[PDB]
Scaffold this active site. Structure first.
Site, PDB file in Angstrom:
ATOM      1  N   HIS B  41       7.786 -42.486 -13.463  1.00  0.00           N
ATOM      2  CA  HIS B  41       7.393 -41.131 -13.103  1.00  0.00           C
ATOM      3  C   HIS B  41       7.900 -40.699 -11.730  1.00  0.00           C
ATOM      4  O   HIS B  41       7.427 -39.690 -11.199  1.00  0.00           O
ATOM      5  CB  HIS B  41       5.865 -40.975 -13.154  1.00  0.00           C
ATOM      6  CG  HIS B  41       5.132 -41.655 -12.034  1.00  0.00           C
ATOM      7  ND1 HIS B  41       4.390 -42.804 -12.218  1.00  0.00           N
ATOM      8  CD2 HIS B  41       5.012 -41.338 -10.721  1.00  0.00           C
ATOM      9  CE1 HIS B  41       3.848 -43.164 -11.068  1.00  0.00           C
ATOM     10  NE2 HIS B  41       4.209 -42.292 -10.144  1.00  0.00           N
ATOM     11  N   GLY B 137       1.003 -41.997  -2.441  1.00  0.00           N
ATOM     12  CA  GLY B 137       2.111 -42.646  -1.776  1.00  0.00           C
ATOM     13  C   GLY B 137       2.279 -44.091  -2.167  1.00  0.00           C
ATOM     14  O   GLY B 137       3.361 -44.656  -1.939  1.00  0.00           O
ATOM     15  N   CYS B 139       2.418 -45.771  -5.061  1.00  0.00           N
ATOM     16  CA  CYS B 139       3.045 -46.190  -6.311  1.00  0.00           C
ATOM     17  C   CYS B 139       4.278 -47.053  -6.041  1.00  0.00           C
ATOM     18  O   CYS B 139       4.974 -46.884  -5.032  1.00  0.00           O
ATOM     19  CB  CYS B 139       3.422 -44.957  -7.140  1.00  0.00           C
ATOM     20  SG  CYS B 139       1.985 -44.230  -7.988  1.00  0.00           S
TER      21      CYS B 139
HETATM   22  C1  LIG Z   1       1.691 -42.642  -7.187  1.00  0.00           C
HETATM   23  O1  LIG Z   1       2.703 -42.023  -8.005  1.00  0.00           O
HETATM   24  C2  LIG Z   1       2.017 -42.371  -5.755  1.00  0.00           C
HETATM   25  O2  LIG Z   1       1.640 -43.174  -4.933  1.00  0.00           O
HETATM   26  N1  LIG Z   1       2.684 -41.244  -5.484  1.00  0.00           N
HETATM   27  C3  LIG Z   1       3.717 -41.133  -4.468  1.00  0.00           C
HETATM   28  C4  LIG Z   1       4.809 -40.154  -4.892  1.00  0.00           C
HETATM   29  C5  LIG Z   1       4.534 -38.720  -4.446  1.00  0.00           C
HETATM   30  C6  LIG Z   1       5.374 -37.721  -5.227  1.00  0.00           C
HETATM   31  C7  LIG Z   1       0.272 -42.159  -7.494  1.00  0.00           C
HETATM   32  C8  LIG Z   1      -0.834 -43.133  -7.105  1.00  0.00           C
HETATM   33  C9  LIG Z   1      -2.151 -42.387  -7.278  1.00  0.00           C
HETATM   34  C10 LIG Z   1      -2.320 -41.469  -6.072  1.00  0.00           C
HETATM   35  C11 LIG Z   1      -3.670 -41.842  -5.460  1.00  0.00           C
HETATM   36  N2  LIG Z   1      -4.188 -42.927  -6.271  1.00  0.00           N
HETATM   37  C12 LIG Z   1      -3.374 -43.265  -7.262  1.00  0.00           C
HETATM   38  O3  LIG Z   1      -3.592 -44.160  -8.064  1.00  0.00           O
HETATM   39  N3  LIG Z   1       0.105 -41.906  -8.909  1.00  0.00           N
HETATM   40  C13 LIG Z   1       0.160 -40.677  -9.409  1.00  0.00           C
HETATM   41  O4  LIG Z   1       0.416 -39.691  -8.731  1.00  0.00           O
HETATM   42  C14 LIG Z   1      -0.124 -40.600 -10.886  1.00  0.00           C
HETATM   43  C15 LIG Z   1       1.135 -40.167 -11.621  1.00  0.00           C
HETATM   44  C16 LIG Z   1       0.873 -38.783 -12.192  1.00  0.00           C
HETATM   45  C17 LIG Z   1      -0.586 -38.435 -11.867  1.00  0.00           C
HETATM   46  N4  LIG Z   1      -1.133 -39.590 -11.153  1.00  0.00           N
HETATM   47  C18 LIG Z   1      -2.391 -39.848 -10.770  1.00  0.00           C
HETATM   48  O5  LIG Z   1      -2.654 -40.841 -10.103  1.00  0.00           O
HETATM   49  C19 LIG Z   1      -3.474 -38.912 -11.266  1.00  0.00           C
HETATM   50  N5  LIG Z   1      -4.352 -39.604 -12.184  1.00  0.00           N
HETATM   51  C20 LIG Z   1      -4.440 -39.095 -13.397  1.00  0.00           C
HETATM   52  O6  LIG Z   1      -3.704 -38.154 -13.677  1.00  0.00           O
HETATM   53  N6  LIG Z   1      -5.351 -39.630 -14.214  1.00  0.00           N
HETATM   54  C21 LIG Z   1      -5.507 -39.324 -15.627  1.00  0.00           C
HETATM   55  C22 LIG Z   1      -4.315 -39.962 -16.321  1.00  0.00           C
HETATM   56  C23 LIG Z   1      -5.582 -37.822 -15.901  1.00  0.00           C
HETATM   57  C24 LIG Z   1      -6.815 -39.921 -16.137  1.00  0.00           C
HETATM   58  C25 LIG Z   1      -4.354 -38.244 -10.212  1.00  0.00           C
HETATM   59  C26 LIG Z   1      -4.837 -36.925 -10.795  1.00  0.00           C
HETATM   60  C27 LIG Z   1      -3.584 -37.955  -8.929  1.00  0.00           C
HETATM   61  C28 LIG Z   1      -5.565 -39.127  -9.942  1.00  0.00           C
HETATM   62  C29 LIG Z   1       1.046 -39.984 -13.140  1.00  0.00           C
HETATM   63  C30 LIG Z   1       2.384 -40.031 -13.893  1.00  0.00           C
HETATM   64  C31 LIG Z   1      -0.209 -40.179 -14.003  1.00  0.00           C
END
Ligand SMILES: *[C@](O)(C(=O)NCCCC)[C@H](C[C@@H]1CCNC1=O)NC(=O)[C@@H]1[C@@H]2[C@H](CN1C(=O)[C@@H](NC(=O)NC(C)(C)C)C(C)(C)C)C2(C)C
Ligand SMILES: *[C@](O)(C(=O)NCCCC)[C@H](C[C@@H]1CCNC1=O)NC(=O)[C@@H]1[C@@H]2[C@H](CN1C(=O)[C@@H](NC(=O)NC(C)(C)C)C(C)(C)C)C2(C)C
EC number: 3.4.19.12
Lengths: 300, 300
Positions: B41, B137, B139
């Site tokens: 992602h 951040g 991931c």
């Molecule tokens: C990860 O991608 C990251 O660290 N992002 C840095 C890149 C910036 C562009 C995150 C790690 C998340 C953030 C805080 N705690 C974590 O576990 N992961 C995501 O952003 C994650 C990816 C989209 C949406 N993501 C989420 O973590 C969602 N969780 C959900 O959507 N949960 C569902 C599936 C609906 C039950 C949020 C809403 C931010 C909690 C993907 C591909 C799911």
């Protein structure tokens, strides 16, 4: 989100974990630049200045992997043996030596025979003990903190008190608390609980969704403290309320407000619930620990 | 003595934490040999095979410090993006890829922008969630175990479930549990408690002086299990009793005996006491964790 008891990345410290052997006594050492630091009772109510003139540089085996280091000189700063070798450490990072106050936390890299076994998160208890995990072999292992790039060594292991806690020193040789490296009777002294740390972790709870423990109630700093003693907590200072502000700012709960809720967690316990997955009030998290984890400050 | 929740030394893993940037999406990657592994992602109900043909190797910024890596090729194994670069990693250790079973533990090195923030000790909950500490951040951060010298990567971060727990994958791309990298409704499923792990930590308690919770009582494997369900614990297998033997050997308490005492901790709670400084029955320690810490197995 989430909230765990989280140690510093141990990479830069591991590179400095070496083996020091002398007689039939093998403990760990900390090789920074051309110095190797280890607890002095490796030369063993002994008289350590007695015992250090008896020895020569050649009596001190120093393995750094399959790479024996030559000692070129030694010296005893308080309870640390400082072994000059003929080789700078290539892996020596930016580092400091620091002495922490009771309440502060640090990461313990735990070694045996110079090899890193594990890393975990202590604080320096009020009675200058630490609640550690140290078997026979673990001496010369270091606590530390990482400040952007700079490792701040703040603790060396030495000895275990009879109740299961651990005693040790700053890397300047001096022992935290009354303890001394001789096999004599010596006691921790009764441990209070670090109050400003319990509050902070509660702000960590709020930043994370546990709100079950709040209330509209405010209290004064004093009337809270009259209840902190009765429950064996630090009296809380205004200077603690100051550090607790940023968390109070980000959550909107006044420090005096959260005090009044801690008051209530003390007088009624918790009735089989948890904060942050604990059934105890966790005091091993400083307010900075919280802001670091609950904001994502990294290290390069 | 002592007993802490203790992570593996993170040195060898830190050397592999790199930054991957694409569009306006920056997460962490794992550079082993000439491959950089990250969650897919980063190229973002998306269709990821859709989105990966749209991109070119030049669309993937790869910083390794102030040292931008060139991608020479990419591929998508399940939910991991594998970025070939033009540079072997000099810091690549002996490593494995492994998929853990629920109950097993591992250490999470937690990164942001490619820089290690912290290391802590998870297990893989029964419902294939982990109780982590992951902000925006984080991931591309990896869980792992160290086997003498060999790092066994077993987990990458991806997403957070709405209750505060965390979902992710083996380094082979595949998600632990039903979870999937799209923003759709998805639930953990109710978490039981890992029973063989609760017993082990109790043997850790015995090896450490807490005996307050024993009794002469034995029980059968079954009659214990009739009480394990009622309290939302794994039924216990004989194959667990087998692994619990070594600890049972070193303490002299029969596994069936300690089961009968856990039975009693469940039916009467604990009455305001603690085991190993916890007021909860800690299931995040495997029987091996215990033997490692309570015996001092290191890593070289
Ligand atoms: C990860 O991608 C990251 O660290 N992002 C840095 C890149 C910036 C562009 C995150 C790690 C998340 C953030 C805080 N705690 C974590 O576990 N992961 C995501 O952003 C994650 C990816 C989209 C949406 N993501 C989420 O973590 C969602 N969780 C959900 O959507 N949960 C569902 C599936 C609906 C039950 C949020 C809403 C931010 C909690 C993907 C591909 C799911
Ligand atoms: C340390 O030196 C070590 O790791 N030894 C490897 C070298 C082998 C020759 C140990 C670390 C201990 C061992 C297990 N847990 C620990 O904290 N430290 C000592 O051996 C320590 C040094 C002697 C006696 N030591 C003890 O730890 C004592 N503790 C006490 O004596 N406690 C008193 C001071 C009586 C209250 C034992 C009896 C082993 C717990 C010195 C110089 C105190």
């Amino acid at each position: 989100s989430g909230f765990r008891k989280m140690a510093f990345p141990s990479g830069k410290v591991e590179g400095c974990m070496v083996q020091v052997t002398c007689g039939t006594t093998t403990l760990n050492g900390l090789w920074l630049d051309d110095v190797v630091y280890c607890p002095r009772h490796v030369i063993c109510n002994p008289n350590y200045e007695d015992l250090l003139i008896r020895k020569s540089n050649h009596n001190f085996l120093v393995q750094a992997g399959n790479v024996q280091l030559r000692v070129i000189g030694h010296s005893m700063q308080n309870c640390v043996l400082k072994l000059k070798v003929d080789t700078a450490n290539p892996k020596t990072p930016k580092y400091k030596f620091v002495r922490i106050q009771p309440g502060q936390t640090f990461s313990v890299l735990a070694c045996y025979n110079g090899s890193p076994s594990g890393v975990y998160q202590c604080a320096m208890r009020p009675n200058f003990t630490i609640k550690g995990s140290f078997l026979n072999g673990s001496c010369g292992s270091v606590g530390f903190n990482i400040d952007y790039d700079c490792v701040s060594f703040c603790y060396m292991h030495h000895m275990e008190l009879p109740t299961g806690v651990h005693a040790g020193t700053d890397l300047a040789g001096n022992f935290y608390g009354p303890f001394v490296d001789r096999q004599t009777a010596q006691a921790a002294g009764t441990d209070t609980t670090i109050t400003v740390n319990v509050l902070a972790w509660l702000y960590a709870a709020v930043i994370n969704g546990d709100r079950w423990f709040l209330n509209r109630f405010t209290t004064t700093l004093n009337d809270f403290n009259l209840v902190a003693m009765k429950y064996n907590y630090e009296p809380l200072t205004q200077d603690h309320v100051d550090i607790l502000g940023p968390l109070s700012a980000q959550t909107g709960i006044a420090v005096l407000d959260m005090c009044a809720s801690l008051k209530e967690l003390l007088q009624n316990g918790m009735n089989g619930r948890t904060i942050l997955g604990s059934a105890l009030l966790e005091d091993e998290f400083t307010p900075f620990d919280v802001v670091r984890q609950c904001s994502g400050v990294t290290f390069q």
